[PDB]
């Protein structure tokens, strides 16, 4: 019963479901960044 | 650690089910999602 | 002052047992689905 139901490492290969490069809203063009879906509607982007 | 506590469990649950409203439609009889509430996830095959 | 003038209830201080009252009647069952939405543009446009 954990809130994050998967063990996530930053070197895990992308799969497009919970580990993938993404682009969010931006003022202009943005470089995609690797992000991790830790729970439903909850994403984490380990980037400055 | 937040989800382990009772209060934090409630807080995360409320956050998850608080989906941003589909208020993007100029027509009152339609429901349109707002783009800024979404992201683009790049799939392995190259589609997003 | 009217005969219909509403009398207000108390203002209970937020105590731990009231938090437990809401915790025991909280619904943790339903979580909104990650539905399939129509694909947006490649670059999402938006500012803070």
């Amino acid at each position, epitope marked *: 019963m954990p809130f994050v139901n998967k063990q996530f490492n930053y070197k895990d*290969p992308v799969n*497009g479901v919970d580990i993938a490069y993404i682009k969010i809203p931006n003022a202009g063009q943005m470089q*995609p960044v690797k992000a991790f879906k830790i729970h439903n509607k909850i994403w984490v982007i380990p980037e400055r | 650690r937040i989800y382990s506590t009772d209060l934090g469990r409630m807080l995360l649950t409320s956050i998850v089910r608080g989906i941003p409203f589909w208020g993007g439609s100029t027509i009152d009889t339609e429901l349109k999602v707002i783009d800024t509430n979404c992201i683009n996830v790049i799939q392995p095959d190259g589609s997003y | 002052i009217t005969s219909d003038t509403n009398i207000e209830a108390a203002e209970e201080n937020i105590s731990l047992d009231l938090i437990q009252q809401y915790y025991l009647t909280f619904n943790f069952d339903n979580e909104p689905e990650n539905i399939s939405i129509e694909n947006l543009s*490649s*670059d999402i446009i938006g500012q803070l």
Partner: nanobody
Amino acid sequence: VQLVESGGGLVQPGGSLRLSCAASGFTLGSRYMSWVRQAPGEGFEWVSSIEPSGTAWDGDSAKGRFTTSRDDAKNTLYLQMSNLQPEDTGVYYCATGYRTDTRIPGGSWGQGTQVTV
């Protein structure tokens, strides 16, 4: 989903090259694409990538040296290399993802093109 590359076999350092990658089964301007090279007896290295919006991103290897272009009408991805170096030797593929560093399930690849410098 078919990808076939075509690029010059060899040239000694100090020159240039144009690699091509012809696609079939989809529209090349609608998916993120990448260029990735593999040196013999080693893993893959992300060379470049191109967005469906036409924006291209190149990694540490050959930034300012290589440029990634794409022709929508021809449905063909181009890699214009200049100032090649001996450490750029390997087999070059046009991978189907963004920053494609390994083989990922559901991802399409090409057979490769030999480049020796």
